[PDB]
Amino acid sequence: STGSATTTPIDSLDDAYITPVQIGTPAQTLNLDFDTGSSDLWVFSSETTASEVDGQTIYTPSKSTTAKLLSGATWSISYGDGSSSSGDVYTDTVSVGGLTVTGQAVESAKKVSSSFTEDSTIDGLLGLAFSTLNTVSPTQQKTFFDNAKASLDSPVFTADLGYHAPGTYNFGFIDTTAYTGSITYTAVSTKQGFWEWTSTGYAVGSGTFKSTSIDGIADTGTTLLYLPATVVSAYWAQVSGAKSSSSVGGYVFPCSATLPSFTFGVGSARIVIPGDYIDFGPISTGSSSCFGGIQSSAGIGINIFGDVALKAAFVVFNGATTPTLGFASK
Ligand SMILES: NCc1ccc(C(F)(F)F)cc1
Prior knowledge:
Elements: E1 3-9, E2 17-23, E3 28-35, E4 41-44, E5 68-78, E6 84-96, E7 99-112, H1 114-117, E8 124-127, H2 144-148, E9 156-160, E10 167-171, E11 184-187, E12 196-204, E13 210-218, E14 225-227, H3 229-236, E15 243-245, E16 250-254, E17 262-266, E18 269-273, E19 279-282, E20 289-292, E21 294-296, E22 303-305, H4 307-310, E23 314-318, E24 324-328
Parallel strand pairs: 3-8, 4-7, 13-22, 14-21
Antiparallel strand pairs: 1-2, 1-10, 2-3, 2-6, 4-8, 5-6, 6-7, 9-10, 9-23, 11-24, 12-13, 12-17, 14-22, 15-16, 16-20, 17-18, 19-20, 23-24
């Protein structure tokens, strides 16, 4: 079997992408953020503290005939930006784009951080990293992808994120009309539970390609591209007037500047990120300083190939017994 679902930016800057997901019987449709950097499926629910909910659609397990409380199970998660949420666990039926899994763990948020509360467009997260990162205790739970794997035609899913436009998440097949050229596959390490891979180098604008190994993760749940300080400094040095700002918390640049592209290596292939993808607009309404889409990973401890990078490519998440990541131009 297969599934296919459209994913849509939540705002004009592509800060995140939401995909409709059907939970329960009869279906309750929630807009979830598909996150290849985490492994929990959690949703705002009828159990979320009422002051912590500001316009989100909530999952109501009492109205689902297929929902079963997973007795004793709890979950607690903290993201790399300091966001947090926690609660109890139901199992229910979950469908994405026609692909249905029965008995999927659905983690009902009793408490959510203020970050999620103030984002009315995101009803929850659907984690697509490896199940070793799932936070359910004492019985760790499997991701949606892991539960769907056996019934999928191929154990893959693909991310085709759009630039200021809708895109597609496909499960179980590779749409050969969605990319140009060939797909370049590269090895994945699962040792930290992420889709972790090694980029073969980079180039700034039309400069020479620097061959150098950049270890990092493929993370649809992270907006920006976080790379080592040396790479980020070489990028921003090509933008007139760019500087790292302590009060803003990263590199900013004059909104009047035009940005060079950024190229990253995948084995022998090259993925080019257009300079327009790196513009995240004014740091405040009316400001002439704009925020950069490429920032240093120094404070984070891991390099993150977020949406800025992934939306320049067609990306295959191959969950075969030896997992790989495939990249193609599009
Ligand atoms: N989008 C999920 C996510 C967020 C942060 C991290 C960090 F910071 F731990 F690398 C990993 C994964």
